[PDB]
Design a protein around this ligand. Sequence first.
Ligand SMILES: [Zn+2]
Ligand SMILES: [Zn+2]
Lengths: 1129, 49, 67
Amino acid sequence: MDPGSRWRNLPSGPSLKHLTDPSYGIPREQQKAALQELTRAHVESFNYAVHEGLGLAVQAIPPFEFAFKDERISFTILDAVISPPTVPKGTICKEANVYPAECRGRRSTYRGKLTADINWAVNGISKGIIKQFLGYVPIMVKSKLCNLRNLPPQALIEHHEEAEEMGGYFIINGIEKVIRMLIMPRRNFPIAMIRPKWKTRGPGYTQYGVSMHCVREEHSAVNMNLHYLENGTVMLNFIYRKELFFLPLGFALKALVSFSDYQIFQELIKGKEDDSFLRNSVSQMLRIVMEEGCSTQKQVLNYLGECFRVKLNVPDWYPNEQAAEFLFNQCICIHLKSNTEKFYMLCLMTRKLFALAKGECMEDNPDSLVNQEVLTPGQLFLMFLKEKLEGWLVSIKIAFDKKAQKTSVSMNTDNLMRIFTMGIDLTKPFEYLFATGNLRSKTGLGLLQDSGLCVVADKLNFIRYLSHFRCVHRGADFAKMRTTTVRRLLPESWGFLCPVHTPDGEPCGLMNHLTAVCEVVTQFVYTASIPALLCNLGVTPIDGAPHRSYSECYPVLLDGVMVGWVDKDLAPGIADSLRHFKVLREKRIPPWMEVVLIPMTGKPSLYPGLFLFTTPCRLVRPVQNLALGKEELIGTMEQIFMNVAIFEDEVFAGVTTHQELFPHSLLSVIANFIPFSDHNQSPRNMYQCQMGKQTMGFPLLTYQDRSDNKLYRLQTPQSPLVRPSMYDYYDMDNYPIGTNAIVAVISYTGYDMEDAMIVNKASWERGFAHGSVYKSEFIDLSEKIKQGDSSLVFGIKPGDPRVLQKLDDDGLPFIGAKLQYGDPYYSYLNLNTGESFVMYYKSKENCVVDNIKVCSNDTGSGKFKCVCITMRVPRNPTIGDKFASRHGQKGILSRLWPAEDMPFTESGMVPDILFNPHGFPSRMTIGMLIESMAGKSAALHGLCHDATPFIFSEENSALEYFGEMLKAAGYNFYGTERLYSGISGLELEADIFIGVVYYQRLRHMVSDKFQVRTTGARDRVTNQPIGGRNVQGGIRFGEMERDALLAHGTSFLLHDRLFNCSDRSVAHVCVKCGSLLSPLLEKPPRNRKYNCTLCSRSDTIDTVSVPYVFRYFVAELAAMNIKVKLDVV
Amino acid sequence: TFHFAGRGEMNVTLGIPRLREILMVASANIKTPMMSVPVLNTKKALKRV
Amino acid sequence: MIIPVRCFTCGKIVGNKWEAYLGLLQAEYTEGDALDALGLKRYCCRRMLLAHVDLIEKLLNYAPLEK
DNA sequence: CTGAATTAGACAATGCTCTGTGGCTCTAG
DNA sequence: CTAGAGTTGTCTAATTCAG
RNA sequence: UAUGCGCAUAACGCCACAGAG
Ligand SMILES: [Zn+2]
Ligand SMILES: [Zn+2]
């Protein structure tokens, strides 16, 4: 193919020789690079954000100045470093470094140490530099700051980590939490869109407007909108601290440059010279500023600083000119750093707005992936870190404000900088984001989302665990909205997002996953040479004359910087030269550059221009450039103007420019694990991607080192005999999730209709699909048992008859031990008192203790009070457990059928799973039939067959191939055998299709789902039963059940279910005045009579029978002075 | 379902939106108003329609 | 994890054939011929040993005592 | 010198049941 | 040391136009 | 109200994620 290509080691077929290799189980000298690239976006974004983006971010924070009694005091941050996780100081250890296994088993946070070199100055002269500790920031595992960096797999085995361990996660309180990739708008690109809700925003606003998402070096993000008004005037929306401000365009364009008004005029009419409506409109916009006495740039800056100083909150000694410069730096086109470049980009956004509003270009779809990119974890980390550094400086100013209000004895600051200790500590506000996902900002960080930013990366199996690092989420705001247009599969996500791998239900179409070849640009390069390179080509500079009409030219954009203009007879030549330079790596053009040339059709197509993108966070995928014969990374917008080919046969000269690496590159990592997926119906492939991730498999290799809440383990998993080649590329036999089963497709028992399935009893009694679940309960005597005195330690009072031969002498169960219900679970004694308490085991499932680990605090000074018991619950397959094939065929076990009653073949073989053939016609999973024929051939010949999709055509069919294999093995061509009846003895007249299908055991068991409530706890407000099966509560008889039982005509059955079995209370009313609130019992002298408080007569009080919620109702209406009068007759 | 059904025919509102228009809203302005009158078999009527 | 004692489908003892299978495959037999030389005739028996992934050698690299 | 229709804003609704875990519920002044 | 990117679809308050 | 033996202990919401049909 191509050397140095990342996809050249993809195997031609699945082998099975690694399972029996003599070097199996010996850890390799180097980690498998196929697996390390699945989390490479996470790691490389965090590596940028912590080393280089942190230096750029602290250079971006302006020097913070404020007012003392007499003199201005300036604070600037010269440097900020994040240190790798070490032990606290004053800790006696042999190893200073902390590793993630400790923070994962002790349930701590794997924290770095942020410290900054803050400089301070009084009266403009720098008096001294302060190195100062700010807080502890979390560390992504296997970053440049993790202590597992650069270690071989033997050294990762030594430190209790996985061999072949990738890390894109944070340990936050012992929990692996991943920042999933959110979909953002395309950065630094004018997205012209139509939104009718913008018409409800001003007096004459139209539905047309150009959005813009400006990010500055991945540490700032500012959304801004131009709007179109019906008189041709443009308003400029900009948001500052989550609130919107509307400025006419002439003020911004006149404040950014010192140009004349005629020169600003010529930049806005530049394409459309003769459209006299635009000419009158932009002369009117320039006239608006002239009418308000702003004839120079300085007067516009003065006016804009006057009008925005209250909301903006500079010190009161800045001029108004500087206060407007502050808003143009914090709010307007922040990716640019020069004001003339802001002028030219803002003129381009206005010209695109004029072309949209005059019906001449088309709406950029915000839902198409062309106009979108990804939010990486390093970007969110670095934005939140820059905001917390700025807030830390403001907290120091508030500290001087408090010491000017309270301790104003006029002590000079002569290294009086232990007031930095009185500043805020940003450990807890930084960990709140990574611990909850909720974003508490004052800026909002340019996001449109406040929550769900961090998600638990749980490790149910490895197929689920890979899906957190490939997931691209659309937004949490979209699941609530009931529209079906953001949930569409659009064709512009060919090869970038997977078509099958998406959930079902509420997140269907929103929670998308990357394809296996797709990858996020995370490298950052210097693009200082690229505009001079473009001007060496035909791109005229933006000041110089373009030597042709601008109506016969293209606007050039290099990363949101408008470079210039190209003669349209030269622009395909420049685009091909840039693709040539990119794929041959010639003139320091990055290999991840998107060279988009949107052509001038003369029709209402997309807005034309030569757009060049080199920024990070874009999705990019490898194809092969057929003209050069080398592999090219093409982007999402770049793809829609290319004709890639899928197969060798589809390549035509002069038509197809590119070609995919392999035809199944449109699918996920996970969706490439479905055998023969082009023979299944597509919802049945979408169901398998979901239930392949719910499988009780083999999660991990470090069971004693892992302290997490539940952990589902399959006992003897098997490699699939029929699997795609991606199963062996990603080495998925390290963590296999299923067993091969001899599946016979027969209607034999009466228990397999309607999705149910039959398992051989004798296979289940041998080791078929047996399992375990490891529950880890972290017991802390400080946190839960808060009685006081802080001196609780695990232990027993010696001679206690509650713990004899049932807990050990440390008050903590034995490690071989079993735990039934009500057994002593742990014992703890109070040391300042002497009294020992015992805690009992309240779960209803018999477990076996696995290990007990005992934890200190971070110093090694903690006392014997934190412990983490891990228990094994058996969970072998029972009636009611759910299995699945690899094709979307889920099914509850209905019956464990004996082996003597099972239909035996002529080979002497029973099946171990019976499948009902009526799961095929409506679902059309033909790939399950091919998998059974292929698995039977693979077992018989001793092979391993390739089940990669799109390798079988109609000429060379799959059924012809595997039938010739079965014919060569002396079996039937069509997969059927002569079975006999195990109940009758007679040979069945039909010819029964049997094979080998690889089944999966899902984690949904009936032992976690049944519940029964006779009587029990009641809600303390309404006296109705409570909800939940862990609290042993009741189930609802809701409104639609009430309706359907009214339709039966059974009224005493509703009276039963909804009055006698929820809340039958007996209230006392005064029959005269009709009031529950009025009766009252006499204070005793017995007698026990009631008095109506209203009419003062004891005769009229009698009982009625009301719900208790009716009494709560009449009391809460009495709280609003509403009288409820009863007619009690 | 969005049946286009050519230009010469008509389309109405289908399904649950039309069922909601009939029942829950009782609107004076439905999305697809329509009348439907048969014509007479008179030759003078067919030359007039 | 570890080689099953019996085949799942029929009760044939297959647990005593794992080291023989590895010694046959290191002696340059085909996997079909190595399953024939062990007397695994039904393909139920034959997938038990053909598809066995032996996670206990990977799971004993984390052996605790290292002494 | 005042009833008139109109239009923008406010507001209320948007399937059902069930199972889990994890963080926080008064931290900032 | 105590403290606070929806979508219909009806109802009402503002908002202009000759008698 | 539940558990344990009249006695002792435990007596919950709100968000956000994930899932089942
Ligand atoms: Zn009374
Ligand atoms: Zn067997």
